Write an enzyme that holds these catalytic residues in place. Structure first.
Site, PDB file in Angstrom:
ATOM      1  CE1 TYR A  80      -2.232   3.533   1.357  1.00 18.12           C
ATOM      2  CE2 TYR A  80      -1.616   2.939   3.590  1.00 18.12           C
ATOM      3  CZ  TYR A  80      -2.120   3.818   2.682  1.00 18.12           C
ATOM      4  OH  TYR A  80      -2.533   5.037   3.120  1.00 18.12           O
ATOM      5  CG  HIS A  83      -0.684   1.343  -4.772  1.00 17.07           C
ATOM      6  ND1 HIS A  83      -1.486   2.001  -5.688  1.00 17.07           N
ATOM      7  CD2 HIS A  83      -0.904   0.009  -4.957  1.00 17.07           C
ATOM      8  CE1 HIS A  83      -2.153   1.096  -6.387  1.00 17.07           C
ATOM      9  NE2 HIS A  83      -1.791  -0.139  -5.932  1.00 17.07           N
TER      10      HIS A  83
END
Lengths: 112, 112
Positions: A80, A83
């Protein structure tokens, strides 16, 4: 359907950011609103809620608020943060950030 | 609209405090030790959660840790603040307190 490991922690992530004086208010709107659309895409997230100093909304050195992201794998939390879609935003926010502290919190209460 | 139903809550309070320089470890454990006892004393206390700053290497203002206590609401918080037991400890902590900021964090999910 990668499936992958089921559950892990869950691990809690505590993040606090304060918008310096200079960033437009409307920008904060799209920032928060955009975050909703971001999670709508970011598969690895499950759910993402925000939390601002609720009480007197003043007594604070300058926290502004904190953002917690629900995850089911400390590893996923890595993907995440790694990202580009999210980085794109974080990068924009950096252009006008007052302070940011990334910390991880785990549910480990003491037996009484 | 809205009816009398349990939802949204409870409220999660987040607190970050730093230990001035020159604080012994035995004191840290002592404070944490007392807390556990204080939690047992403090009748009004849904639950007590504690965590450690994951990854202190870098990316931190000096929070070290954060104290989060579960309360029924803002009204219950009044009881906690109006506690002599907590005050007694506060006075002790004041002996070696750097900073202390109180912040409230509530999980507010948005409809996607």
């Amino acid at each position: 359907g990668s499936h992958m490991e089921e559950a892990k922690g869950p691990v809690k992530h505590v993040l606090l950011a304060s918008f310096k004086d200079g960033v437009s208010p409307e920008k904060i709107e799209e920032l928060i609103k955009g975050y909703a659309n971001l999670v709508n895409l970011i598969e690895p997230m499950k759910a993402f809620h925000w939390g601002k100093d609720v009480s007197i909304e003043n007594l604070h050195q300058g926290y502004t608020h904190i953002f917690e992201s629900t995850f089911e794998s400390k590893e996923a939390v890595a993907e995440y943060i790694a990202h580009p879609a999210h980085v794109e935003f974080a990068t924009i926010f950096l252009g006008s950030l007052d302070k940011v502290l990334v910390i991880d919190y785990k549910p480990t209460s003491v037996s009484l």
